[PDB]
């Protein structure tokens, strides 16, 4: 018996008086105490909706309904929100497409563009290893790759992760981006071969034959991995996927590979590279999930496990905008002497 009903009732009482800042803390607290508490989700939805935060209200109702599909108070409200959410999400994909288009208006040989592209190349390597706890600094990663000399006082393992990423990004940018044709299984194993080849050569480029623990999660049985990965690459080359928005498609491709967890190590890194391969193949620039976005990343992945991928997609879309804003942050300004 969760003792959050107390918290929910006070929240409703505060809301009645109009102490809304005290209400949402009691709402948040009620779902801290019981995250699967239908009345608190539903009531906190209505709350959010009164403040015109439609996406949150809709998330909350959608959570309530994944737990209790027949909860009539939620069913009625999510009918009203779902269409307005589709609208809001669609307008954000338009602003991103705006910035992509402006970025792809820059002549290919532009120097400023050349320099920020290679600056952000080291940024993407730094963030994709640092988000997992790799203690190497940006300047250390540039040092390792520009020269070929190991950084003093940093483990071999950390530095091989960096070289490994570099080896993988070469292979994608050289081979797979330009290449007309299907994204085969062999492509995904080849990325993983390079990602992990310097740290764990034995496992580098082959699927796990064992069960794994990923925190409190247990991904699919190793005998389902082969089946589910063949459904994945079939979906990657399918007509439905090309029917999706490319950012939407890239986000789903990423989440699916994370969920399947087909390798022992380097699923995260291997699926952040696949995401970028998908975006680039569609004419979109590759993107970075910054180190400091670790919590947001975990939480949106967790929301995707609890039956709602939309927050994850929105997350990837915001990361896409933040990349474009950076590329655009190198554009011409009037000046004379």
Numbering used by the authors: 103 to 439
According to the publication:
A single ER‐localised Fic protein, FICD (HYPE), catalyses both AMPylation and deAMPylation of BiP. FICD is a class II Fic protein (with its αinh N‐terminal to its Fic domain) and an ER‐localised type II, single‐pass transmembrane protein, with a short cytoplasmic portion and a large luminal‐facing catalytic domain (Worby et al, 2009; Bunney et al, 2014). We report on the transition of FICD from a dimeric enzyme, that deAMPylates BiP, to a monomer with potent AMPylation activity. Mechanistically, monomerisation relieves a repressive effect allosterically propagated from the dimer interface to the inhibitory Glu234, thereby permitting AMPylation‐competent binding of MgATP.
Co‐expression of reciprocally tagged FICDs confirmed that the wild‐type protein forms homomeric complexes in cells that are disrupted by a previously characterised Leu258Asp mutation within the major dimerisation surface (Bunney et al, 2014). These techniques also reaffirmed the strong disrupting effect of the Leu258Asp mutation (in the principal dimer surface) and revealed a weaker disrupting effect of a Gly299Ser mutation (in the secondary dimer surface; Fig EV1D–G). We therefore conclude that between 0.2 and 5 μM (concentrations at which the experiments that follow were performed), the wild‐type protein is dimeric, FICDL258D is monomeric, and FICDG299S is partially monomeric. Complete monomerisation resulted in a 19‐fold increase in AMPylation activity and a 2‐fold decrease in deAMPylation activity. Monomerisation does not result in large conformational changes in FICD. Accordingly, the greatest root‐mean‐squared deviation (RMSD) between the Fic domain of the FICD:ATP structure and any other monomeric or dimer relay FICD structure is 0.53 Å (observed between FICD:ATP and FICDL258D:Apo; residues 213–407). In all ATP‐bound structures, the inhibitory glutamate is displaced from the respective apo ground‐state position, in which it forms an inhibitory salt‐bridge with Arg374 (R2 of the Fic motif).
